[PDB]
Amino acid sequence: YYVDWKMLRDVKRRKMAYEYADERLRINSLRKNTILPKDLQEVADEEIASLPRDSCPVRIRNRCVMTSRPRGVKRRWRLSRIVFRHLADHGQLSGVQRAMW
């Protein structure tokens, strides 16, 4: 299984964002411009709204990989602030040490 149902849903959110990333990337070019008339922009707005909800990368939440904690997770290690300590104080990550200056 996964860590939590929240993480299971977030995986599907990321998958749907990767699936419909091209369509939104092509449609937003019709809205974020000022050369083309607004008549087609108002239609492109409805078209991109007709897309499924989980297709936008905005619903993607950066959780942890080990415990799927919704907050307090570094972006480089993708680990929670507590699992990162539990591993660093064990010494399974190179270069990490107690800051002493």
Binding site: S29, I35, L40, V43
Partner: protein
């Protein structure tokens, strides 16, 4: 090592004006598509076929939506 990018060169990536012939030259369509061409030329992440597919998507979208461009007041083909 192990990635040849289909043996393409810089003229297949940067110079993409060859795919904008099926568009009105003096209309706003060229003004809109020059930005897409510059963005695709400044994108080392995508290949040539994906940029061709984007150009074709725009072509068929604009060719399917013919009533909106005629209603907007600017004559487009």
């Amino acid at each position: 090592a192990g990635f040849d990018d289909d043996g393409s060169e810089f003229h297949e990536h940067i110079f993409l004006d060859k795919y904008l012939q099926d568009f009105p030259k003096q209309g706003p369509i060229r003004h809109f598509m020059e930005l897409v061409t510059c963005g695709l030329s400044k994108n080392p992440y995508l290949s040539v076929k994906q940029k061709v597919e984007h150009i074709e998507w725009f072509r068929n979208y604009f060719n399917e939506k013919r009533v909106i461009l005629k209603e907007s007041g600017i004559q487009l083909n």
